[PDB]
Amino acid sequence: FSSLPSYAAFATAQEAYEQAVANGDSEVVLKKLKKSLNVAKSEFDRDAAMQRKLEKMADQAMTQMYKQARSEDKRAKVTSAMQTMLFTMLRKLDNDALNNIINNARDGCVPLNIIPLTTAAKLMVVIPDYNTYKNTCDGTTFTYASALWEIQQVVDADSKIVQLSEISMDNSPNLAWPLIVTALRA
Amino acid sequence: SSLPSYAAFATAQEAYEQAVANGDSEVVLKKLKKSLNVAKSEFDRDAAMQRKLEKMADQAMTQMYKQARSEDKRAKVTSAMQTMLFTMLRKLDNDALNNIINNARDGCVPLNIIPLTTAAKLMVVIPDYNTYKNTCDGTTFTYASALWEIQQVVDADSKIVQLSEISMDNSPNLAWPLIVTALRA
Amino acid sequence: SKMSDVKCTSVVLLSVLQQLRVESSSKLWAQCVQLHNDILLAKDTTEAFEKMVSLLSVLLSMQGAVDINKLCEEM
């Protein structure tokens, strides 16, 4: 607006109007100068409101461009995170037993519920009280899913390690149940 | 509203009011109407600018106050909650809560949860002989406005101690703080 | 108001215990939660006060976590 020539035209028309007010020309000339000042002010109004609308729109387009760039960068970051998650879960497979059971299926499909039950190497048993502990995994080896498991650790609900010499009927009150016994496939 | 545009609108309004009080005529009357109108519209544009500015100032005051008070409240949350709790505990004026608090000031705190059942076990540490004298008598033990029967008094060196050793004179030979295991009557 | 000041002091007292990280000790947090829920569903003020004694005695049991001689001083 200010750098536009319309501002210069309005400013010089205002200067001419002040000079004619101080100069006392004829009333028809004064009406003429008021007319020229008014059309200069109308052109200034048009161009200045035009540039204000223009710069509002340009700032809007810049803001939406920022939003698009942020969305696309976050999409790239989420695709990277999903891909690395899938590839770590690939490296965590137990490929010998998994290949054995998949090649033992007549179609190549096995239900998902028996993928861990025949290929997992670690069994986590969660035990709520002592009678359950006595019945499911008494001693340092036990049986579940037709294999034999060897107890490698027992933690309590507080993630504290609990020795197997602790879990007795008289020390059952002082343990923070449930107990999470982690066993390995023998 | 006392603005420069209000000075201009004021002098234009005064001139038009006086000239219409005379009310003579006619072309200068229209000229004065036009001058008053344009000055008034300039004033109203400026008053709109003032209203927008004061509305933005008002939102700034409100938002700054909300941010300051909210972050101050979320900072002192532990101390405010503890002070509130002990205010409420003093307001209840219960005679058991007062007793366990007035013991816990001195140092006679329990080592487990106080039980509710008849004949269950409570282990409270007693730090000094005078705190023993205030709570124990013979073998009864008055705690939490309940009577408890002492079973067993151990020392800080975990040696058992008989209740006849606890004397006004033998107490410097003890190994404080005692741990009293008692059972609810 | 005497019943409904113990029902609110349980709320404040369990908030204090939770801020002192009681809940990292699961056997203790189970009993504190059970005492809290038993006070809130109580119709007789005597049993509410006994459960409040048992619950507060968890807070007094931990030595340096609070400063009881400073908090009680102002009252």
Add this chain to the structure above:
Amino acid sequence: AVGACVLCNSQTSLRCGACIRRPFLCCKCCYDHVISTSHKLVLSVNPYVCNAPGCDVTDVTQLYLGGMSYYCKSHKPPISFPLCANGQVFGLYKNTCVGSDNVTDFNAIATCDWTNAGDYILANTCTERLKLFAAETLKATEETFKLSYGIATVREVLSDRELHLSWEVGKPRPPLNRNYVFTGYRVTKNSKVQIGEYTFEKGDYGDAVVYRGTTTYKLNVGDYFVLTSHTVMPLSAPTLVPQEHYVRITGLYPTLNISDEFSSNVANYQKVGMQKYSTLQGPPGTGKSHFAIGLALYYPSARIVYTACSHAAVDALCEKALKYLPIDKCSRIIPARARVECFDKFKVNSTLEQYVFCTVNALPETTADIVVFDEISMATNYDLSVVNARLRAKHYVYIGDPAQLPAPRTLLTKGTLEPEYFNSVCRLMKTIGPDMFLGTCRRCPAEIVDTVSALVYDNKLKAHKDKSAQCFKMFYKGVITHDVSSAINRPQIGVVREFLTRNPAWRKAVFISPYNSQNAVASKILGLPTQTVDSSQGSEYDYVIFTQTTETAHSCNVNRFNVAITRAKVGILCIMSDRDLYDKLQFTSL
């Protein structure tokens, strides 16, 4: 960003702008501070600069508030009102504020350049929040004085452990010791990048500056060195936690049959139990640092943090604990940087042990049950504030003596600081008297006590020893050479070298000289362990070889001399420089 006014603790939002620490100030106090001094810049939640497009007016007496910004006199909108008006600079919480009168002291604290003698006596008899602010601004001044030192540039690399340095022209040389770490640069076109944290020491032969470094980089010609400056952390905790005389002992459980050695100290242990903080004052070698271990052995269930400002004071405490206390339940804390080597026999950096040991600057935020701050003469109110911010505990025992030598106070050059201004606690021991007092020299031979109970402590010491006939003090002038600022005296090292072939039992003696550089340079002629007088405070030795280097105001300081000669357990050789002091003591002539 609201806060509390320093000198009346009202709520406020202003901060003085010319003060180095930006102290929060209430409205009336900020007007008093900006109407008297020349500190005319104020910051609110936003600064009080003129928000013209281009204008530089910051003087708060000039600005006006208009719209939502602060404009100078020549850009104000007609809806505006002055800030610095009515006696109150406008900030938040304007009408809930209490004026004060200490603005005749806060100005002097915040304005002075800390060089005269009076500024430290004003920084130590004001109120507590002003004590913290004065300590903080003193630390900041001492930090920004280090920017006035010169800048180094390599001329050549004589050897991989021998640089050659040229310093900036017109700017004073820093002193070369392991306190002052430098950073390297290779800034030419091409990598204006730090190339390692180095530290220097002036090698004996030539103008060689033997440098130690963190990294393993080869140094070129163009590599140049800038001193590092540490930002001062703001401080909050009071210098002295308020005392509360208890009725009976709390938190501490005494012991049955403590020992036969600490049997005469039992009353002071009960006094430590009864109070909140207690202060112990004794002349040197009279059981003060021993008393702390006796406090360990009288309250065995009490977790203790021992602290001091040096590292040799805390190492003397560490040795005494090694002799007495169980070594499994003890510790020691060393900072990660650690330009100096410390005592390494405890399980280092395990703060959970029952008996922690530390320097006051490197304390971890923990609790205790009684905390022992040894050597309070070497402590400033910054140090006591830090030990009160980190360590939360039930009892405090401040041990030390004012007549030993203080914190150095590098800025202080015009005047002398009496003991009762060293910090708050030394003031307390020289205002109302110490809570516990033990004077009887159980360490030094009676000759040392006979000459040191006439200089400082006016005939108040008797020793549990006799004249041990191994106290020799000679008078040799010692023509000096000058290092950076720490002079070095070759012929006195010469006479000491003569006193090492001709006295064989003394080859375990420790060298003591008032200057750090001579302490480094007499290791390469003699080979004895070396210790400076300022850092020797609190640890004793069997035989001590002291060498007065120069006749000045520093090495002829009687407190420095006292802490120099009261460390010899059985024998001492003192190569003097001043005539009167050599006549003041009464040794053998030699």
Add this chain to the structure above:
RNA sequence: CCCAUGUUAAUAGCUUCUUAGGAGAAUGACGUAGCAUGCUACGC
């Protein structure tokens, strides 16, 4: 002419409030063009 130090929170509905954008309307005011008639200065 100098000495000590670096610590987990779903789907959906309704409602209140605040802010921003746009459109439309309504009124008022200014300016430009066009028209209606009147008046006046000139020519016929």
Add this chain to the structure above:
RNA sequence: GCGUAGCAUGCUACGUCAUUCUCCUAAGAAGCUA
């Protein structure tokens, strides 16, 4: 009587400025219900 010029008043169109209303959308805070 007409044409030209100017002035007044009224209407219509367009450009702008303020006030009010309605709505549509966006964003946020909150409450209740299953």
